[PDB]
Paper text:
The catalytic core of CaMKI takes a canonical bilobate architecture, with the N-terminal lobe (N lobe) consisting of five antiparallel β-strands and a prominent helix named helix αC and the C-terminal lobe (C lobe) comprised primarily of α-helices.
Therefore, we co-crystallized CaMKI320 with ATP and successfully obtained the complex structure, in which ATP is observed with evident electron density; however, no Mg2+ was visible despite the presence of 20 mM MgCl2 in the protein solution. Upon ATP binding, CaMKI320 undergoes significant conformational changes characterized by a different N lobe orientation, the disordering of helix αT of the activation segment, and the formation of helix αR2 of the CaM-binding segment compared with the apo CaMKI320. In particular, the residues on strand β1 of the P-loop exhibit positional displacements of about 5–7 Å, and ATP bound at the nucleotide-binding site interacts with the surrounding residues via a network of hydrogen bonds. The CaMKI320-ATP complex displays structural features of an inactive conformation. A detailed analysis indicates that helix αR2 of this conformation plays an important role in the maintenance of an inactive state of the enzyme through interaction with Glu102 and stabilization of the inactive conformations of helices αR1 and αD. Specifically, Lys300 on helix αR2 also forms a salt bridge with Glu102; this interaction does not abrogate the ability of Glu102 to bind ATP as Glu102 still makes hydrogen-binding interactions with the 2′- and 3′-hydroxyls of the ribose moiety of ATP, however, it could have an impact on its ability to bind the substrate as Glu102 is also suggested to play a role in the recognition and binding of Arg at P(-3) of the substrate (see discussion above). Furthermore, the side chain of Gln305 of αR2 forms two hydrogen-bonding interactions with the side chains of Ser291 and Lys295, and thus helix αR2 also contributes to stabilization of helix αR1 in the inactive conformation.
Author numbering: 10 to 54, 64 to 163, 182 to 314
């Protein structure tokens, strides 16, 4: 933790890379080194810095430094130039259970590590899952330090690290069909479906998906936090540890469902479709 006289003495603030609820992420140059970073600027509505600065993991975005101004906190992060999770899936032509499995393994591995350090996302979502670079074989990254929230947290019951495993469960669902497992225009009923963990592998969107992927999802999207798979157990499941994930081209359907259920995606495919032509 440092205290900048004027942070712009240290960093050249450029483009807004993304936007949060209470934050915005900005592309900046470290003027001292010429290296490119992402800076999360958080408005003012240590113990955290200590553990957060100790985070060293391939599939987690590094917290390089922290500066504090009059009314802001500036988190100097590893720059990632790959884009969000669903954006890439929608923009690329071939998608399989295998690609989904290879993505979940990484998320599990990263989250497991975070739980060993005592960190608990609790708000892990696809917007927090970014590709490291633009290449096809690029790894996924957790950036951060509406259905994704575990039933117990919404029940205001006591909860633990297991809430992240539920969140990972939900992402795996969308990664295989393209739409959230809990959907309703009325917010009140939506929270009831989540609290009851009531969901199905409805046809025909779930016709080509293997049984092992379903069983896997069932064990993470478990209402009981004590029956729910840990990161370790899910990492030991055949769908992640074995060879049960299929190589069926399930892209078109998953992609269209994402474009339908997520506003950003429909024209992210369009921008990229036009930008690549040149
Ligand atoms: N290290 C990074 N490199 C490049 N882009 C990033 C980086 N971190 C975040 N972004 C972009 O900025 C967005 C904001 O990230 P965050 O602000 O961490 O996500 P969020 O969905 O807004 O979660 P929250 O509302 O809790 O802040 C990301 O979705 C992504 O588009």
């Amino acid at each position: 933790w440092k205290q900048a006289e004027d942070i712009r003495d240290i960093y050249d603030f450029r483009d807004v890379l993304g936007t949060g609820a209470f934050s915005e992420v900005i592309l900046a140059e470290d003027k001292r080194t010429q290296k490119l970073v992402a800076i999360k600027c958080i408005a003012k509505e240590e113990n955290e810095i200590a553990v957060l600065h100790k985070i060293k993991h391939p599939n987690i975005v590094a917290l390089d430094d922290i500066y504090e101004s009059g009314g802001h906190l500036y988190l100097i992060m590893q720059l990632v130039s790959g884009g969000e999770l669903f954006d890439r899936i929608v923009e690329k032509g071939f998608y399989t259970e295998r690609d989904a499995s290879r993505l979940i393994f990484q998320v599990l591995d990263a989250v497991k590590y975070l739980h060993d350090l005592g960190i608990v996302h609790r708000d892990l979502k696809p917007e927090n899952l970014l590709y490291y670079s633009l290449d096809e074989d690029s790894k996924i990254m957790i950036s951060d330090f509406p259905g994704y929230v575990a039933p117990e947290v919404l029940a205001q019951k006591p909860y633990s690290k297991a809430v992240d495993c539920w969140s990972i469960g939900v992402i795996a669902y969308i990664l295989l069909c393209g739409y959230p497992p809990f959907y309703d225009e009325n917010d009140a009923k939506l929270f009831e479906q989540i609290l009851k963990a009531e969901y199905e592998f409805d046809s025909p969107y779930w016709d080509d998906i293997s049984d092992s992927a379903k069983d896997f999802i069932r064990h993470l999207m478990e209402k009981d936090p004590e029956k729910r798979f840990t990161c370790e157990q899910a990492l030991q499941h055949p769908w992640i540890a074995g060879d049960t994930a299929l190589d069926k081209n399930i892209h078109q359907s998953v992609s269209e469902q994402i474009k339908k259920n997520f506003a950003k995606s429909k024209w992210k495919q369009a921008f990229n479709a036009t930008a690549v032509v040149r």
